[PDB]
Structure formats: C-alpha cells, structure tokens
Amino acid sequence: SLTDSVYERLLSERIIFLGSEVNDEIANRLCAQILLLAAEDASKDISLYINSPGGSISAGMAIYDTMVLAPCDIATYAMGMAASMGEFLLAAGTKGKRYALPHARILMHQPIAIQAEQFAVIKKEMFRLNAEFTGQPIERIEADSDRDRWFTAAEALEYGFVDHIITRA
Amino acid sequence: SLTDSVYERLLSERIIFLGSEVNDEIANRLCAQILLLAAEDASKDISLYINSPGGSISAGMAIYDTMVLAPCDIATYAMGMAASMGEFLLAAGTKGKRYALPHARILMHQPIAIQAEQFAVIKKEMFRLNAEFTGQPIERIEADSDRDRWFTAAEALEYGFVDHIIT
Amino acid sequence: SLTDSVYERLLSERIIFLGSEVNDEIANRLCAQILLLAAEDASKDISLYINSPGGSISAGMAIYDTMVLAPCDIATYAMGMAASMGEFLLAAGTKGKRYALPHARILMHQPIAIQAEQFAVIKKEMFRLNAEFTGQPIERIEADSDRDRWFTAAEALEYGFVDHIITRAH
Amino acid sequence: SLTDSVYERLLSERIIFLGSEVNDEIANRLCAQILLLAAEDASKDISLYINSPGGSISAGMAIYDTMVLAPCDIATYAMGMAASMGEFLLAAGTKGKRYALPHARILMHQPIAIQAEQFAVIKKEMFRLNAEFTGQPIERIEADSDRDRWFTAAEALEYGFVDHIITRA
Amino acid sequence: SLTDSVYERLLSERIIFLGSEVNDEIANRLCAQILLLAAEDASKDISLYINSPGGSISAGMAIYDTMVLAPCDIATYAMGMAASMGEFLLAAGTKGKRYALPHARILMHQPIAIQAEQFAVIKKEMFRLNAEFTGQPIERIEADSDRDRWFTAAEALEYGFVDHIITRAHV
Amino acid sequence: SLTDSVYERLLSERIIFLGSEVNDEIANRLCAQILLLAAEDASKDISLYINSPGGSISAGMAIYDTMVLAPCDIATYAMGMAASMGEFLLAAGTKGKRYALPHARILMHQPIAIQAEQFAVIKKEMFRLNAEFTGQPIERIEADSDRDRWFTAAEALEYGFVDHIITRA
Amino acid sequence: SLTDSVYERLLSERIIFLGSEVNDEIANRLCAQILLLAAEDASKDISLYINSPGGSISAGMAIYDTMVLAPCDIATYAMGMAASMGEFLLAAGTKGKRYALPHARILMHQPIAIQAEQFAVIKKEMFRLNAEFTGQPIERIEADSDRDRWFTAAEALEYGFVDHIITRAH
C-alpha cells in the first residue's frame, strides 16, 4: 500500500511516526523501528514525529525504554497533538533536540490486586520521569495531570516539554 | 494496486494529492509525504493537487505546519473542489504558486470543557491565517465563512485564495 | 492482481481507461494518470478508452480540466457505453482523434441551497462546452439531454461526438 | 496469486483466455488485454482460448469490437464450451484461424423503452454478424438460436463456426 | 503466498498438480499451465501429479483435449488418489509415462433436454477413451464404473491405468 | 507475509515444517515442497521438522510416498509433538537421521462400503509400516496404538521411532 | 506490509520478536526464525525481544528446545511483559546475555487422563529448568509460581531472571 511504502521510505531517512493512540501493538511496531534504526547505524540521529492522543502507560513506557536503549539521539517533534504518553515521549527526546511545531498542543493526563500493584509502580515512574524531562517538581506534575492541563507550543517551551519551537527546518 | 502505483509514481515527480476529506489519518499520510519529499531534495518544488471537501481544523493545521516546515516551496492547485480546510491548504501554498484550474470551486465554511478551550483557539488561529493568506480582513473571513461563501476560479483569484488560473 | 497489472502495462503504452461510473475517487485516479503521462512525456498522445455510465458532473469536470491542461493530445474512444459525463469526455477529445467502436452507445441525460447553486453553474457550462464539442446549438444539446437521446456509433458520428468509427483494423 | 501469475505469463506468449461468463467486467479485462498485445506488437498473432457459457450481448460485442480494432490476426480456440456470446467470439476469429479441440461443444442461444431499443439493435447485429461469420443465412441463425441448437466439433466445422478441428499442435 | 510460490517454482521444473476436484475453475487453471509450459518449450516433458477425487466430465475433457493439444509428452503420476476424472486424466498420460506411487489408489466411478443430450454424448466418449487408455473392453469399463471398482497400485498396473509403479526415483 | 517469507527462506536451506494437522491440503503442500527440493538437488538432504497432532492416514500416506520417492535423505525432527500420522512421518525419516529434540513427545493412536474397504487396507498398511520403522512386532504397534501410548524422547529412542536425541546441532 | 517488512528487516540484523501470546502457531514461527538464523550463520548471536503474556507450556518448550539446538548464543530482552512461558524463555537465554528494560514486568504463574499425565511431566521439567536458569531452589520456584509472584526489572535481576538492566545506551 502507498501509505506503508511512504513510511518505509521515511524509515530509510531515519524518520519515524507515532501517529495514533499508544497501545501494545503500536508500541511493538515502534520499538521494532527504533531497534532497526539503531542496529543499522548507531551514530546517525533518529527523528520521531508525534501526533498522538496517547494511551497505555506500559505501552508508552516500552517505547521509552527503547529510546533509552538506542545509542543514537532521538529528536522528537510535536507535529500536531502530544497528549498523555504522547507528551511523555515528546519530553523524553534527547535534550537539545525536542521540538514543537508552532500550532502543536501538549496535553497532560492522569491515566486485579496484581494489576493495581503494577499500575501504581508504573504510574509513579511516569511522574518521576516527567519531572526529570521538564525540570518541574513531581508535585506540579501530579497536580497538572489531575486537571488535564494543556499547553500551546510557547507554553510547552516555557514548561520544559521541548527545547525549540521550529517554523522553517 | 494500480491506483497506489500511480500515486507512488507521481511522488517521484514531486506531486502529491489531497483527494479526500481531511482527518487525522489523511493528515498523517500527507505530512509523511511532505517530510519525505523534503528529505529527498530540500530545494525542488513540491506540487500539491487539491480536490477535497475539507474536514477537521486540527488535522489541517498539522498539514499546514508541515507545509511551512519544509524548506522547499509548495505550489498548490485547486483541481476540483477546495472546501473548508482544503481551501485553507490551497491558500497556504507559497505566494506566487497558488493555482486554480478553470472549473475549480472554492468554498468557505465554519467547522469537554478543555476540548472546547482548544477548539476556540485553533478556530481563531485559522481565521487569522486565512486573512493573512488572502489579504482580506479577519472580519470578512469570519462573515464569509459563516454564510458558506463559495467561489468560481475567477472569483477566487480576485478574493486572494490563488495567484493564477491555469488553462 | 492480473487486472491491475494489465492496466499498468497499458499505462506504459499511454493508454488509460474509464470503465466505471465517474465519482470523486475515479476522477482523482484519472487526473493522476493524465498528470503522470503528461510529466513523463509532454509530446506523445494519450489514449482514453471509455466504457462508463458517467456520474458526477463536477468530478467529470475536473477530469476535463486535466485533459485541457495536458500539453499533449488526448485521443478518446467509445468502447461500450459513453453516458452523461462519459459522453462529455469522449466529445472533449482532441478534434480529429475521437473514435467510436461500432457497437458503442452514446447517451445524453440531464445530469443543499449551495449545492444547487454550484450545480446550476456547472450544468450550464457543460451544455456550453458540449455544444462547442459537437457543433450543435446549445438548445439542441439541452432538448436532447431532456428527452434522453441515445446514439449508435453512426448516429454519434453524424451528430458530432466523434470523428471516426473503427469498423476495421486501427 | 498463482492463477494470475500464469495468466500474466501467458500474455507474454500472446495467449488470452475467456474462461467464464461474458459480462461488463470480463469484457473490460479482455479488451484491455487485446489492446495491450496489439500495442506491443501489431504484427504477431494473438491466441484466444474460449471456455465460456456466453453472457451479455453488449459485453460480448465490446470484445468483438476490440478484436476488429486489433491489426494483428486473432486465432480462436473452442477449448471446451463456446455457448452464446462464447460461440460468437469463437466464430469472430480471423478466418483460417478458428479452431475446435476435438471434444469442444458449441451452443447457439437467443439471449426502459430505450433499453428495449438498444437491445433490439444490438441483437439484430449479433445475428447479422453470426451469419457473416458462418456463411449461413440470418433466418437459419435465428431459428437455430431459437431452439438452442448445439454442435460437436465436427458439426461445428460443417456449419462454419470454425475452420479446423485441431488435435495436436 | 508460500503455497503459490512453491507451485510457481515447481512450474519452472515443469511440474503441475491436480490436487483437488475437477471443476471448471480448476480445468481453466490446468489448461492454462499446460499451454504455458507448451509455449515455453514444445520439446520437454510436463509432469502432472494427481491427488484428486475427480469431478465433472466436461471439465475433465477440456484438460484432456489440452493434454493432447500440447506437442510435448505429459507424464502422469498417481500421487495419492486418482478417482473418477482424476483416474481418467492419469490414464490419459503419454503411454510409457503413466506412474503410480506405491500407496496410490485408483477409483472408477460413473458421474434440460439439450443438457441431457450433451451428457449422454460425453459419457459415452469418456468410456470409449478409458477403454482405449487401459486396453479393456468398453463393457468392462462400464460395469467396473458402475460398481465403483477400486485398485491398489499393483492392481491398477495390471488393469492398464499406469505403465510403472515407482517407489524411488533416480538421479 | 513475514511468516511465509521465513518458510520460503527456510526452503532455500532445504528445511520444511509439518506444524499442523495432516489433511489433504497440507499433504499437497508438503509433497509439493519435497518434489521441489528433490528437483533442485537430488543429492542434498532435506530436513523435516514435525510438530503435528496427526490426522488423515490417506494424506499421511501420500506424504510418505513422496518422502520415499525423493532420491535424497530426509532427516526428521520431532520438534514438539509427533502424534498419530505425525509420529508415523517422524518414524519414516531416513534411518540414522531421525531425531527427537529433548522435550518432544510421541503419541501413538489409531484413527461408503467402498470407503470402509479402502480404510481397512490403509490402516493395516500403516501398522505394518510403523512396525518396520520401529522394529516392533505388528501386534505391539496395534496394541499400543489402541491404548494411546505416549513417549518421552528417551522412551521414543528406546522403542525405535528415532535414532538420536539432539540437544545441540 | 510496513510491520512485516520491519520484522523482516530486523531479521537481517538477527533480531527476533515474541510480542504476543505463546501458542502452537507462534511457537512454530518462532522456531522457524531461529532455525533460519542458525542456518544462515551458526556463529553470530540471535537477539530475542520479549513482550509476551506467555501461554502454552508445550509450545514454550518447543521454542526452548530450538534455542538450545541452535549453535549460536541467544541473547534475550524483556521489553514490556514476560509472563509465564515468556518469563521462562527470557530466563533461558545465554547466561551473561539476558537483559531487562527498566520498566519491564516479569510474572510467575502455575501453568484427558493421558493429557494430565503429559502435563504433570512437562510442568515438573518447566520448574526444574526454571530453577537452574535462576539459580533458585525448586521449592522457591514452585511457591513463587503458585502465589503469582511478579517482579520489576530490578527485582528480576536480584532473583536471577536477567543479568543486565539497560538503563542507558546499549
């Protein structure tokens, strides 16, 4: 299919997309791409373009673990919407190389005994890391998640999610 | 498929199409193609052919932002219908390279708390940009969007959506 | 698929097909082919084979524009049915290069406030252009459309839709 | 698929099949194939193998019109069944080059105001062309079609549908 | 698909399969392959492996006519089952090149006015050719067909459906 | 598809799988693969990996005949389960080149008037062949099948289904 | 498809995925991929990336056997979830080359007369092999399994499922 072909040609340009909700399948597909790119060249940058309403914490956290694993820098681009885990992945890009396009929007969001244990542990990790990415205190991160705080590109720059607003490349 | 094969072959001629309703999926597809073409050659024009009834404001703005991001010029062509966000994208092409075909039509249109907040600002920012694109005052853009004003090629040239009618 | 494969190889001989109703997707696919062939070589003819019930007047008008835009001649061929916009596109072929196969049928047909406005404008322009293509007066085009006039290949030649009837090797 | 792959490969050998009922979609595919072959090389024969219960006169007649348009000879082969418009396309082959396999069978068949009118015109044309193909009077063709006359290969040869019964190539 | 790619690769070795019932679709696809192979090289054997419960007579006769039309020999191999028209196609292979594998099984079987006239004619012809293929009298073919007579590989060899039973091929 | 692409590439290594129930379809595909491999090179081994719960004796028998027809050795490997016709085909590999992986399991099992006749002779023939593959008396094959006797790798070696247990290739 | 060509291109880097439930079909495709890589080059590592809820004990043991069969080292990575047989296969990778990503979760679980017999036998092996992979006593494996003990990456390193936690560029 044309769509798939275009994505695969972009993969050759080391450009990847997170263009839908983050779930187990998409995480797998995306981890795979990051691994492939790192395997074929450890030193050339990867560009991750994000337009995603976000989703599952464990799914987003696996994409994150893989971004960390990859030896090359991962530039991130808030291309349309970066919400929930989409915001987290945006903020996880290599510092110096996190970008918002001028009309992007960044949203924060707060997403059986064993499941509850596992979720409590991963949720706390998400807040901790969101704090490291942005330089905000954890408490500010929790409160802002709770009230579904959202950000224009400028506001996002100011808050610490991105390093640059890019207009012309 | 034959139809995907033709669009692929056109990609090599730096021609792309918006031939359907703008939603997230289509916005993604179209941003991918622009990024690709910009990666392959930052200094050759891209041509964007438009036959589209429009769609969501946010999806159209991601396309717009990618259009601006590409270092290369983007020529736009109204091929059949450029309505709503399709009119916006047409009017967004590089000044001097916006074209209407002789029988093209141009159509203007207006398209939970936190959702409403974001919509209000993106809607306002779209009227703002449409005014810049066309040289009309913001007030004329709003009033004309409101009443679903539509345009023949000639009328579109005069109003400022395009720079040339090509025959 | 075999079908797609054959249409692709025919695209290499600069032959294209309109074999179904005219709607937006089909119009898009068809303007794309015309643009593709125009870009590959602006000097060589394109052949359009038509077997179509027609369909959307605005869709057909976009294809027509792309024909006019192409720097090369477009030869047109009526294969089975050329109805409404299919008849229009056949008649729009470069004069001298419009063909009917002998058992072709050519049919004329009469083809929300804002939709009606646009349709009135597009409709008048289609009649105007069809008049020009065939050499018939505008009122003859109108009345013939109203009464659903159809034409054999021979009748189509006489009326002005085409220049040739292929009754032997071409 | 394998099936489509063998048909494609057969196109390179200038062989085409009519292996099913004649309708608008089949007519399109077949006209397309003849046009392709004629464009590639106007001077080499095309071989059309027919195993068809016939179908639409309209669709059959489009294929026939393309056969005439084609400058190269078209050899026709009754492969199993040539009924109705399948009989028609067989008998439409280049004279001297219409063949029946030894066990082929050949079936004749007689198949809103303005639909009726288009139908009358094209039906008269079918009878007239079947008459020319076979050397039979149109009245014979009409009566024979009326009563669903059928033919062994030998009988079909006598009647004028084919020029040869072929057993070995 | 893997399966298709395998059959296609086999096609290059001039090897074809009848692995399902004989119907119109299958007949078209087999005739297509025979014709392709005969065009590619008129002087090299085609090998037809059969594992089929048979099916329509007229469909089977079209395959048969195409087998005869091809200038090259068709070698036939009873691979599992050869029943009804599958038996007939097996038996129609080039004399000296019909094979049974050791555990193959051969099964005989007997399969609107104008439709009836046509069926009567091809049924008779099918028996006539089965008699010619095997060397058996027409009345033996008819009666054996009636009672659904079946054969081991050894019994099929003696009856005349094949010319060889092969266990191990050579190199 | 990925799956098919790996099975294809494995075919170039001369490796085939029986990883589902043995029925006519799978028998056809497997015969096809053996026939192809023998045609490309009649002197190189073929390796057949088995993870199958068995099925039709007919189908199994056609595969067996093709294994024997192929001039090259066929190594068999019981990869997970070899049950019923799967056990049969495992035991049918070239003697000296039948293998169990360490955790494989081998299960014995026993699976219109004219249909009953045929079934009786192939069942009897299958027991006979199983007795010859294994070196067990025919009555013990019959008895053990009747009671669904199953085997660890070590017990299958002892009984005669395989010649070796492989741990590292 | 995009995904499939990605998984295939990764195969060229000798990297495999177990990203779903373990069953017979999946076990087959995974053993196939291992045998392929082993055949291509018997002396380069294979990397197995695991995000799996586990599944059938039989299917898992076929995968395990094939990894033991392959003459090359098999490195293993817990990418998201490794539960039941997923944990087993992770723990089965070449010692020195078992990895967890920091937010991975490792879960233990307790996994017709004839099927009961067979099952009893595989279950005992599974525990036994799990004990040697981890260096943990059999009683402990058994008790942990039947209370559904789960582990973070760090707890998994302590217990013996992995040798490394990847907290920086690998």
Q: How far apart are CA A79 and CA B65, in angstroms?
A: 8
Crossing angle of helices F24-40 and F57-69, in 10° steps, is 0
CA distances, B58 to each of A83, A166, B66, B115 (Å): 14, 18, 13, 12
Which tokens is A152 given?
């224009």
Number of H helices, E strands in chain A: 7, 7
Contact B103, C64 (CB under 8 A): yes
| CATH number of the domain to which G23 belongs | 3.90.226.10
Closest among D6, A28, C10 to E33, alpha carbons compared: D6
Which tokens is G45 given?
């590592």
CA contacts within 13 A on the Cβ side of D164: 14
Closest among D119, D120, D149, D153 to D136, alpha carbons compared: D149
Contact B100, B78 (CB under 8 A): yes
Q: How far apart are CA G86 and CA G163, in angstroms?
A: 16
CA distances, D114 to each of A131, B99, C1, D121, D124 (Å): 77, 43, 36, 10, 15
Residue of B nearest to C64 (CA): B103
What DSSP assignment string belongs to G100-136? E-TT-EEE-----HHHHHHHHHHHHHHHHHHHHHHT-
Which are the catalytic amino acids of F? 84, 109
C9 close contact with D: CB closer than 8 A: yes
Q: Which helix (H) or strand (E) holds F27?
A: helix F24-40
Query: Which SS3 state, helix, strand or coil, does residue G141 take?
Result: helix
Question: Which residues from A are below 8 Å from G19, CB to CB?
Answer: 24, 28
Question: Which residues from F are below 8 Å from G71, CB to CB?
Answer: 168-169
- Cross-chain CB nearest to C15 (options D7, D27, D39): D39
| Residues in contact with A143: Cβ distance below 8 Å, sequence separation at least 6, in sequence order | none
Query: Which SS3 state, helix, strand or coil, does residue B83 take?
Result: strand
Q: How far apart are CA F80 and CA D83, in angstroms?
A: 55
| Residues in contact with D158: Cβ distance below 8 Å, sequence separation at least 6, in sequence order | none
- Amino acid identity for residue D33 in this structure: Q
The conformational region for residue D14 under phi > 0 = left, psi -120 to 50 = alpha, else beta, is: left
| Residues in contact with F74: Cβ distance below 8 Å, sequence separation at least 6, in sequence order | F34, F45, F46, F47, F48, F67, F93, F94, F97
Contact G163, G97 (CB under 8 A): yes
- Amino acid identity for residue E151 in this structure: F
The conformational region for residue G99 under phi > 0 = left, psi -120 to 50 = alpha, else beta, is: beta
Cα dihedral A13, A14, A15, A20 sign? positive
Q: How far apart are CA D129 and CA D92, in angstroms?
A: 8
Question: What are the residue ranges of helices labelled H in chain E?
Answer: 2-11, 24-40, 57-69, 85-91, 113-134, 138-146, 153-159
The number of domains in chain C is 1
Which tokens is F21 given?
């129930």
Closest among B76, B101, B3, B153 to C36, alpha carbons compared: B3
F70 close contact with E: CB closer than 8 A: yes
Crossing angle of helices E57-69 and E24-40, in 10° steps, is 0
Closest among F88, B59, B145, B114 to A81, alpha carbons compared: B59
Query: Is chain D in touch with chain G: ≥3 Cβ pairs within 8 A?
Result: no
CA distances, D10 to each of D31, E34, E38 (Å): 16, 11, 11
Cα Rg of chain C (Å, integer): 15
Q: How far apart are CA F132 and CA B74, in angstroms?
A: 77
Question: Which residues from G are below 8 Å from A117, CB to CB?
Answer: 150
F33 close contact with G: CB closer than 8 A: no
Query: Which SS3 state, helix, strand or coil, does residue C44 take?
Result: coil
Q: How far apart are CA F109 and CA F126, in angstroms?
A: 11
C151 close contact with B: CB closer than 8 A: no
Q: DSSP class of residue A22?
A: B
Count of other CB atoms within 10 angstroms of residue A61: 26
Query: Using the beta-carbon criterion (under 8 Å), do B39 and A6 form an inter-chain contact?
Result: no
Q: Which of E7, E36, E115 to mutate to test the interface with D (most CBs of D within 10 A)?
A: E36
Q: DSSP class of residue E12?
A: T
Closest among D88, D111, D69 to D162, alpha carbons compared: D88
Query: Which SS3 state, helix, strand or coil, does residue B21 take?
Result: coil
Contact G99, G78 (CB under 8 A): yes
- Cross-chain CB nearest to B36 (options A13, A81, A169): A13
Query: Is chain B in touch with chain D: ≥3 Cβ pairs within 8 A?
Result: no
F44 close contact with G: CB closer than 8 A: no
| CB environment E59-97: b (16+ within 10 A), e (fewer) | bbbbbbbbbbbbebbbbbbbbbbbbbbbbbbbbbbbeeb
Pairing of strands G15-18, G46-52: parallel
Output phi, psi for G107, to 5 deg. Answer: -120, 135
Q: DSSP class of residue C14?
A: T
Residue D111, classified by CB atoms within 10 Å of its CB into exposed (0-12), middle (13-18) or buried (19+), is: middle
Q: How far apart are CA G169 and CA A61, in angstroms?
A: 16
- Cross-chain CB nearest to G8 (options F5, F19, F166): F5
CA distances, C44 to each of B107, C15, C40, D61, D102 (Å): 36, 11, 9, 30, 47
Pairing of strands A46-52, B74-83: unpaired
Q: DSSP class of residue A41?
A: -
Contact A51, A81 (CB under 8 A): yes
Which tokens is B74 given?
């983007």
Residue B77, classified by CB atoms within 10 Å of its CB into exposed (0-12), middle (13-18) or buried (19+), is: buried
Query: Which SS3 state, helix, strand or coil, does residue G30 take?
Result: helix
Output phi, psi for D92, to 5 deg. Answer: -75, -10
G102 close contact with A: CB closer than 8 A: yes
CA distances, C87 to each of C61, C76, C84, C153, F136 (Å): 12, 10, 5, 12, 82
Contact F18, F50 (CB under 8 A): yes
Q: Which of E6, E65, E114 to mutate to test the interface with D (most CBs of D within 10 A)?
A: E65
Q: How far apart are CA D3 and CA E26, in angstroms?
A: 10
Closest among B7, B29, B19 to B54, alpha carbons compared: B19
Query: Using the beta-carbon criterion (under 8 Å), do D62 and C49 form an inter-chain contact?
Result: no
| Residues in contact with B116: Cβ distance below 8 Å, sequence separation at least 6, in sequence order | none
Query: Using the beta-carbon criterion (under 8 Å), do D36 and C9 form an inter-chain contact?
Result: yes
Residue of D nearest to C104 (CA): D62
Q: Which of D17, D41, D65, D88 to mutate to test the interface with C (most CBs of C within 10 A)?
A: D65
Q: DSSP class of residue C9?
A: H
The conformational region for residue F18 under phi > 0 = left, psi -120 to 50 = alpha, else beta, is: beta
Question: What are the residue ranges of helices labelled H in C13-162?
Answer: 24-40, 57-69, 85-91, 113-134, 138-146, 153-159
Contact E75, E127 (CB under 8 A): no
Q: Which of C52, C101, C147 to mutate to test the interface with D (most CBs of D within 10 A)?
A: C101
Closest among C10, C3, C58, C5 to C37, alpha carbons compared: C10
Out of B47, B84, B103, B164, pick the active-site residue.
B84
User: What domain range is G31 assigned to?
Assistant: 1-170
A38 close contact with B: CB closer than 8 A: no
Question: Which residues from A are below 8 Å from B58, CB to CB?
Answer: 80-81, 105
Query: Using the beta-carbon criterion (under 8 Å), do A80 and B27 form an inter-chain contact?
Result: yes
Contact F141, F127 (CB under 8 A): yes
Pairing of strands C150-152, C105-107: antiparallel
Query: Using the beta-carbon criterion (under 8 Å), do G103 and A114 form an inter-chain contact?
Result: no
Query: Using the beta-carbon criterion (under 8 Å), do G150 and A114 form an inter-chain contact?
Result: yes
Closest among F105, F110, F104 to F85, alpha carbons compared: F110
Query: Is chain B in touch with chain F: ≥3 Cβ pairs within 8 A?
Result: no
Closest among C21, G2, D20 to A9, alpha carbons compared: G2
Q: Which helix (H) or strand (E) holds A130?
A: helix A113-134
Q: How far apart are CA C122 and CA C112, in angstroms?
A: 15
E40 close contact with D: CB closer than 8 A: yes
CA angle G26, G28, G29 (to 5 degrees): 65
Query: Using the beta-carbon criterion (under 8 Å), do C79 and D65 form an inter-chain contact?
Result: yes
- Cross-chain CB nearest to G17 (options A32, A68, A70): A32
- Cross-chain CB nearest to G6 (options A24, A32, A122): A32
Q: How far apart are CA F62 and CA F139, in angstroms?
A: 24
- Amino acid identity for residue D129 in this structure: L
Query: Is chain F in touch with chain A: ≥3 Cβ pairs within 8 A?
Result: no
Cα Rg of chain G (Å, integer): 16
The neighbouring-strand residues paired with F150 are: F107
- Nearest chain E Cα distance for residue D99, angstroms: 12
F8 close contact with G: CB closer than 8 A: no
| Residues in contact with C164: Cβ distance below 8 Å, sequence separation at least 6, in sequence order | C98, C99, C100, C157
Contact D109, D86 (CB under 8 A): no
Question: Which residues from B are below 8 Å from C59, CB to CB?
Answer: 80
Looking at chain A, the residues that come just before a C–N gap of over 2.5 A are: 111
Crossing angle of helices C138-146 and C113-134, in 10° steps, is 120
Q: How far apart are CA F81 and CA F83, in angstroms?
A: 6
Three-state secondary structure along D15-74? EEEECCCECHHHHHHHHHHHHHHHHHCCCCCEEEEEEECCECHHHHHHHHHHHHHCCCCE
Query: Using the beta-carbon criterion (under 8 Å), do D103 and E39 form an inter-chain contact?
Result: no
Which are the catalytic amino acids of E? 84, 109
Contact D82, D108 (CB under 8 A): no
CA distances, E152 to each of B149, C5, C151, D67, E159 (Å): 84, 46, 67, 51, 10
Block residue for tokens 């579109």: B156
Q: How far apart are CA B81 and CA B20, in angstroms?
A: 10
- Nearest chain E Cα distance for residue D101, angstroms: 6
Question: Which residues from G are below 8 Å from F2, CB to CB?
Answer: 4, 7-8, 29
C102 close contact with D: CB closer than 8 A: yes
Residue of A nearest to G150 (CA): A114
Chains that touch C (3 or more CB pairs under 8 A): B, D
Which tokens is C73 given?
């001649």
Query: Using the beta-carbon criterion (under 8 Å), do B36 and A49 form an inter-chain contact?
Result: no
CA angle D108, D110, D113 (to 5 degrees): 155
G65 close contact with F: CB closer than 8 A: yes
- Amino acid identity for residue D131 in this structure: A
| Residues in contact with E152: Cβ distance below 8 Å, sequence separation at least 6, in sequence order | E105, F121
Block residue for tokens 């294929």: D63
CA angle B97, B101, B106 (to 5 degrees): 90
Query: Using the beta-carbon criterion (under 8 Å), do G61 and F51 form an inter-chain contact?
Result: no
Closest among G133, G129, G111 to G120, alpha carbons compared: G111
Query: Using the beta-carbon criterion (under 8 Å), do G6 and A66 form an inter-chain contact?
Result: no
| Residues in contact with C98: Cβ distance below 8 Å, sequence separation at least 6, in sequence order | C75, C76, C90, C91, C161, C162, C163, C164
Closest among E89, E77, E81, E90 to E152, alpha carbons compared: E81
Which technique?
X-ray
C50 close contact with D: CB closer than 8 A: no
Which tokens is G21 given?
């439930």
Q: DSSP class of residue A42?
A: S
What DSSP assignment string belongs to D134-152? H---HHHHHHHHHTT-EEE
CA contacts within 13 A on the Cβ side of F117: 10
F148 close contact with E: CB closer than 8 A: no
CA distances, B90 to each of B98, D150, E170, G85 (Å): 7, 64, 72, 55
Q: How far apart are CA D84 and CA D123, in angstroms?
A: 12
| Residues in contact with B115: Cβ distance below 8 Å, sequence separation at least 6, in sequence order | none
